[PDB]
Amino acid sequence: NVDAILEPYKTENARLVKENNEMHLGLLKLREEKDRISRELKAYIRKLDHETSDLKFLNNQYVQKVRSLEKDSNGKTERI
Amino acid sequence: RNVDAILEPYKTENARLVKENNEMHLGLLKLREEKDRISRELKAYIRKLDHETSDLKFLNNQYVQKVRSLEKDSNGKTERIL
């Protein structure tokens, strides 16, 4: 009789425990996806941030050469 | 009061599980939005760096063409001197 009184509460509890476990795992799955994504994209950003820095350095290297070659093309006109 | 004492743990635990499940159901929605926001923001910053790279690559070739142009003249002017 006690078992018949308790059965609805034991069934509901089992339903809620199943759901609680599923949601804990779901959150963990999702936080791992977010964590995996963020670290991948942030790494690819660092790779592109290096390429930009190299291209910016190389562009200044050409600016210094253009100023050097323009001085030479001016010295050669003084000689002419 | 003995039936009440037998069911009180399930009544309490069930109420605790419902509260937690509701909070985690919101937690999942909040988390999927955060993941989508993070992904959009980082993928956008990647595109911003992609354009800068393309502009720097185009500008670098523009300097390569000028260096070849200036080197030709700096060679033609030496020939004129001789």
Distance CA B26, CA B4 (A): 32
Q: Which residues of A12-35 are buried (b: 16+ CB within 10 A; e: fewer)?
A: bbeebeebbeebeebbeebeeebe
Distance CA A61, CA B41 (A): 33
Distance CA B22, CA B20 (A): 5
Contacts of B4 by beta carbon, 8 Å cutoff, 6+ apart: none
Longest distance between any two alpha carbons in chain A, whole Å = 118
User: Which stretches within chain B are classed as H helix?
Assistant: 2-81
Cβ(B7)–Cβ(A6) below 8 Å: yes
In this complex, which of B31, B45, B74 lies closest to A31 when CB atoms are compared? B31
> Experimentally, how was this structure solved?
X-ray
H/E element holding A80? Answer: none
Taking an 8 Å cut-off on Cβ atoms, the answer to whether A56 and B56 are in contact is yes
Distance CA B73, CA A71 (A): 13
Collapsing DSSP states into helix, strand and coil, what is residue B82?
A: coil
H/E element holding A56? Answer: helix A2-79
Measured CA to CA in angstroms, residue A17 lies from A14, A30, A53, B10, B22 at distances of 5, 20, 54, 11, 13
Of the candidates A74, A55, A12, which has an alpha carbon nearest to the alpha carbon of residue B70?
A: A74
A17/chain B closest Cα distance in angstroms: 7
Distance CA A70, CA B67 (A): 10
Tokens representing A79?
């000689």
CA atoms within 13 A on the CB side of B61: 5
Mutate to test the interface with B, among A21, A25, A50, A59 (most CBs of B within 10 A): A59
Q: This structure's resolution (angstroms)?
A: 2.6
Of the candidates A6, A3, A55, which has an alpha carbon nearest to the alpha carbon of residue B51?
A: A55
